[PDB]
Design a protein around this motif. Structure first.
Motif, PDB file in Angstrom:
ATOM      1  N   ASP A 121      12.621 -21.313 -27.183  1.00  0.00           N
ATOM      2  CA  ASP A 121      13.631 -21.251 -25.630  1.00  0.00           C
ATOM      3  C   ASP A 121      12.839 -21.144 -24.496  1.00  0.00           C
ATOM      4  O   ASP A 121      12.225 -20.129 -24.171  1.00  0.00           O
ATOM      5  CB  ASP A 121      14.565 -19.711 -25.792  1.00  0.00           C
ATOM      6  CG  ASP A 121      15.353 -19.769 -24.530  1.00  0.00           C
ATOM      7  OD1 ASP A 121      15.539 -21.006 -24.071  1.00  0.00           O
ATOM      8  OD2 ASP A 121      16.070 -18.697 -24.483  1.00  0.00           O
ATOM      9  N   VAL A 122      12.584 -22.341 -23.884  1.00  0.00           N
ATOM     10  CA  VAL A 122      11.435 -22.521 -22.807  1.00  0.00           C
ATOM     11  C   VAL A 122      12.067 -21.740 -21.482  1.00  0.00           C
ATOM     12  O   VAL A 122      11.285 -21.915 -20.417  1.00  0.00           O
ATOM     13  CB  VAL A 122      10.610 -23.843 -22.861  1.00  0.00           C
ATOM     14  CG1 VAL A 122      10.389 -24.348 -24.159  1.00  0.00           C
ATOM     15  CG2 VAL A 122      11.865 -24.848 -22.219  1.00  0.00           C
ATOM     16  N   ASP A 123      13.135 -21.905 -21.171  1.00  0.00           N
ATOM     17  CA  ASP A 123      14.015 -21.570 -20.084  1.00  0.00           C
ATOM     18  C   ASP A 123      14.423 -20.350 -20.075  1.00  0.00           C
ATOM     19  O   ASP A 123      14.950 -19.622 -19.159  1.00  0.00           O
ATOM     20  CB  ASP A 123      14.528 -22.660 -19.538  1.00  0.00           C
ATOM     21  CG  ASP A 123      15.872 -23.155 -20.461  1.00  0.00           C
ATOM     22  OD1 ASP A 123      15.927 -22.656 -21.509  1.00  0.00           O
ATOM     23  OD2 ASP A 123      16.813 -23.934 -19.972  1.00  0.00           O
ATOM     24  N   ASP A 125      17.427 -19.098 -21.591  1.00  0.00           N
ATOM     25  CA  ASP A 125      18.767 -19.142 -21.480  1.00  0.00           C
ATOM     26  C   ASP A 125      19.401 -18.633 -23.036  1.00  0.00           C
ATOM     27  O   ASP A 125      20.612 -18.547 -23.173  1.00  0.00           O
ATOM     28  CB  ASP A 125      19.575 -20.202 -20.969  1.00  0.00           C
ATOM     29  CG  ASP A 125      19.370 -21.466 -21.846  1.00  0.00           C
ATOM     30  OD1 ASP A 125      18.384 -21.431 -22.960  1.00  0.00           O
ATOM     31  OD2 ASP A 125      20.092 -22.330 -22.022  1.00  0.00           O
ATOM     32  N   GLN A 127      19.194 -20.522 -25.874  1.00  0.00           N
ATOM     33  CA  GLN A 127      19.565 -21.652 -26.665  1.00  0.00           C
ATOM     34  C   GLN A 127      18.151 -22.303 -26.921  1.00  0.00           C
ATOM     35  O   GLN A 127      17.367 -22.450 -25.887  1.00  0.00           O
ATOM     36  CB  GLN A 127      20.555 -22.651 -26.132  1.00  0.00           C
ATOM     37  CG  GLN A 127      20.807 -24.021 -26.593  1.00  0.00           C
ATOM     38  CD  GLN A 127      21.508 -25.049 -25.922  1.00  0.00           C
ATOM     39  OE1 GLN A 127      23.010 -24.939 -26.040  1.00  0.00           O
ATOM     40  NE2 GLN A 127      21.068 -25.934 -25.210  1.00  0.00           N
ATOM     41  N   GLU A 129      15.160 -24.869 -27.367  1.00  0.00           N
ATOM     42  CA  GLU A 129      14.778 -26.374 -27.319  1.00  0.00           C
ATOM     43  C   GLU A 129      13.997 -26.791 -28.601  1.00  0.00           C
ATOM     44  O   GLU A 129      13.468 -25.910 -29.492  1.00  0.00           O
ATOM     45  CB  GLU A 129      13.771 -26.484 -26.033  1.00  0.00           C
ATOM     46  CG  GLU A 129      14.398 -26.474 -24.572  1.00  0.00           C
ATOM     47  CD  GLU A 129      15.224 -25.129 -24.459  1.00  0.00           C
ATOM     48  OE1 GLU A 129      14.549 -24.006 -24.398  1.00  0.00           O
ATOM     49  OE2 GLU A 129      16.552 -25.371 -24.176  1.00  0.00           O
ATOM     50  N   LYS A 157      15.821 -30.564 -24.607  1.00  0.00           N
ATOM     51  CA  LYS A 157      16.987 -29.747 -24.747  1.00  0.00           C
ATOM     52  C   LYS A 157      17.988 -30.157 -25.442  1.00  0.00           C
ATOM     53  O   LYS A 157      17.863 -31.505 -26.030  1.00  0.00           O
ATOM     54  CB  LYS A 157      17.715 -29.622 -23.004  1.00  0.00           C
ATOM     55  CG  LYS A 157      16.867 -28.556 -22.357  1.00  0.00           C
ATOM     56  CD  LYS A 157      17.542 -28.540 -20.951  1.00  0.00           C
ATOM     57  CE  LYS A 157      18.297 -27.059 -21.162  1.00  0.00           C
ATOM     58  NZ  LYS A 157      17.464 -25.841 -21.145  1.00  0.00           N
TER      59      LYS A 157
HETATM   60 CA   LIG Z   1      16.689 -22.969 -23.737  1.00  0.00          CA
END
Ligand SMILES: [Ca+2]
Ligand SMILES: [Ca+2]
Ligand SMILES: [Ca+2]
Ligand SMILES: [Ca+2]
Ligand SMILES: [Ca+2]
Ligand SMILES: [Ca+2]
Ligand SMILES: [Ca+2]
Ligand SMILES: [Ca+2]
Ligand SMILES: [Ca+2]
Ligand SMILES: [Ca+2]
Length: 583
Positions: A121-123, A125, A127, A129, A157
């Motif tokens: 989960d690179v960002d 949130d 969810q 990637e 994504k």
């Molecule tokens: Ca994510």
């Protein structure tokens, strides 16, 4: 201690079927056994009373419906999950940006196909990637000379947004045993980074070239056997270089590793291991046929730091040479909370000290989990390549290395599997070299399942199904034969005869595992999620210490299937909540 694990969203998914809309979601590691759920279609509650099981069939839903789930915690309803739209197909497509083909210095044309993936989960949130490795059509085994095309690593994504591409460049040879990429939140800020061996000419996701941009260390064999070698941690969201150090294990002399033509020197593995029992560390390894080295790193507080080295060439470490597989496992085998490394026929402690060697040597498949739930501790099932090995298949105490049972083959045993496929024998069955066995080493009937590749939790029962090529099969244990359960038409597996999916992981929905397969032309990845109902709820597998680490190493060398830290299967006990925190 509680382990750092990912803050995940509800993983809510909704899939159109003939019976209506199949909906599944995560039971999060942060949630108690007393947690129940309400299912909402466009703000309207569907279930008269809160439900326990994390899947639900909405008979009256349509392709335009959206879903949310609300947890009910000690009597009070919680805020809604993220919203989920209905999949119009049994899989979700992630469109890809297929890299253009190229031509080697020797005039050989090559094209690209989608290959091994990982997730992170690179960002932040909740969810995942997908981090995808592309393979040029002229990629090479270490035994084979020849120039290879560049290796490309992309981040996508799930909606198809391409976040970045890293080009590892001319000084990183393409092939199964070369790039081993780790995707993980190493520093604990809630966002994954990507770590891998790099070289002069590696281009980061922002287009910045590392080291000496134009240096060319390819020899006439198309191998890169000289020049600097680097280890880089890249930002997960952008593919930007964060830090780069000289790579360890360092090359030294090619011949140090057991040949001079460049095979053994370039045998790499990697992993994520909680060496301190709380936070992740990065493991980079080199060699296994003879000289073997392992090096542990942390990436924390913006800095890469080397923790320890194990080097078989050091006086006292001789037994730790010649034992590794084309794969490894990571698990707390001794019960101290910290992860150890199962490196084929040997094991390495959380502090880098060699633990044991069975002496059985190199093999091609490896399974570390609770294979025998009647025997305290984890077990390792392994196959062996040396025709003169005492055993072609070995089943051992994970912590001490003591052989519980083994069977002499007198030939290379290239494949072996572990999975609970027969409920008449407690624990996971294992198979290799034409025979199926109980966890106690008792041969079961005659013959074996039709594949010896991956095990996958796909249907509604606690037994494990089998995956190979573009197929999921189920073992009919009464009748001693495999029967197909899914053939993913238009999807293709990878890596030639190894026939591995791009990824198998519980990425979304309930505890069953998703499969990510490329399309035949690599224009897309397809994410298949089961719509077979189950009566069982289990914690999302990505919140299990051992399973989560298995997903991190799935890509490496000869991809192996993941296992849980506990016995998941027929007759299993209800599991307690995982001991974890999130950033
Ligand atoms: Ca994510
Ligand atoms: Ca991070
Ligand atoms: Ca341990
Ligand atoms: Ca230990
Ligand atoms: Ca081998
Ligand atoms: Ca056990
Ligand atoms: Ca069994
Ligand atoms: Ca099953
Ligand atoms: Ca799932
Ligand atoms: Ca691989």
């Amino acid at each position: 201690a509680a382990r750092q694990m990912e803050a995940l969203n509800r993983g809510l998914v909704a899939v159109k079927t003939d019976g209506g809309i199949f909906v599944s979601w995560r039971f999060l590691g942060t949630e108690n056994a007393s947690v129940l759920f309400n299912v909402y279609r466009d703000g309207q509650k569907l279930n008269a009373a809160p439900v326990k099981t994390t899947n639900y069939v909405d008979k009256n839903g349509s392709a335009g419906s959206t879903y949310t789930v609300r947890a009910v915690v000690n009597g009070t309803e919680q805020p809604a999950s993220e919203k989920a739209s209905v999949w119009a197909q049994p899989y979700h497509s992630v469109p890809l940006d297929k890299p253009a083909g190229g031509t080697t210095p020797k005039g050989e044309s090559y094209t690209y196909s989608a290959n091994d993936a990982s997730v992170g989960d690179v960002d932040g949130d909740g969810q995942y990637e997908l981090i995808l490795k592309w393979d040029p059509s002229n990629s090479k085994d270490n035994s084979q000379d020849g120039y290879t095309g560049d290796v490309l690593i992309d981040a996508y994504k799930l909606d198809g947004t391409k976040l970045w591409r890293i080009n590892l460049g001319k000084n990183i040879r393409a092939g199964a045993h070369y790039t081993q990429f780790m995707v993980y939140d190493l520093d604990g800020d809630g966002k994954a980074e990507v770590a891998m061996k790099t070289a002069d000419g590696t281009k980061d996701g922002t287009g910045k070239v590392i080291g000496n941009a134009n240096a060319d260390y390819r020899n006439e064999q198309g191998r890169v056997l000289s020049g600097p070698e680097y280890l880089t941690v890249f930002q997960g969201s952008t593919g930007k270089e964060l830090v780069t150090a000289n790579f360890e294990p360092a090359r030294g002399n090619v011949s140090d590793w057991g040949d001079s033509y460049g095979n053994r020197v370039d045998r790499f593995l990697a992993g994520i291991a909680y060496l301190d029992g709380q936070r992740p560390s990065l493991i980079m390894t080199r060699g296994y046929y003879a000289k073997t080295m392992l090096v542990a790193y942390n990436f924390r507080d913006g800095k890469l730091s080397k923790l320890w080295t194990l080097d078989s060439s050091k006086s006292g470490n001789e037994a730790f040479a010649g034992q590794g597989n084309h794969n490894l496992s990571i698990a707390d085998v001794d019960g101290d909370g910290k992860d150890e490394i199962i490196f084929g026929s040997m094991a390495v402690d959380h502090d880098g000290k060699g633990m044991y060697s069975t002496g059985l040597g190199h093999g091609d498949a490896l399974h570390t989990g609770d294979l025998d739930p009647g025997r305290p501790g984890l077990e390792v099932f392994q196959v062996h390549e040396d025709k003169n090995a005492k055993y072609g298949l070995s089943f051992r105490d994970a912590a001490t290395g003591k052989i519980l049972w083994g069977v002499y083959a007198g030939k290379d045993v290239g494949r072996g599997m572990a999975a609970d496929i027969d409920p008449r024998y407690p624990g996971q069955e294992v198979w290799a070299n034409g025979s199926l066995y109980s966890a106690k080493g008792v041969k079961i009937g005659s013959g074996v399942p039709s594949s010896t590749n991956f095990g996958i939790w796909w249907d509604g029962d606690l037994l494990r199904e089998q995956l190979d090529s573009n197929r999921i099969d189920k073992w009919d244990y009464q009748n001693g034969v495999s029967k197909n359960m899914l053939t993913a038409s238009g999807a293709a597996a990878n890596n030639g005869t190894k026939a591995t999916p791009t990824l198998q992981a519980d990425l979304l929905g309930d505890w069953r595992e998703e499969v990510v397969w490329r399309t035949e032309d690599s224009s897309a990845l397809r994410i298949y999620t089961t719509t077979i109902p189950t009566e069982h709820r289990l914690y999302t597998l990505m919140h299990d210490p051992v399973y989560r680490l298995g997903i991190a190493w799935q890509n490496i060398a000869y991809n192996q299937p993941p296992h849980t830290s506990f016995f998941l299967g027929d007759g299993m006990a209800e599991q307690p909540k995982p001991n974890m925190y999130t950033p």
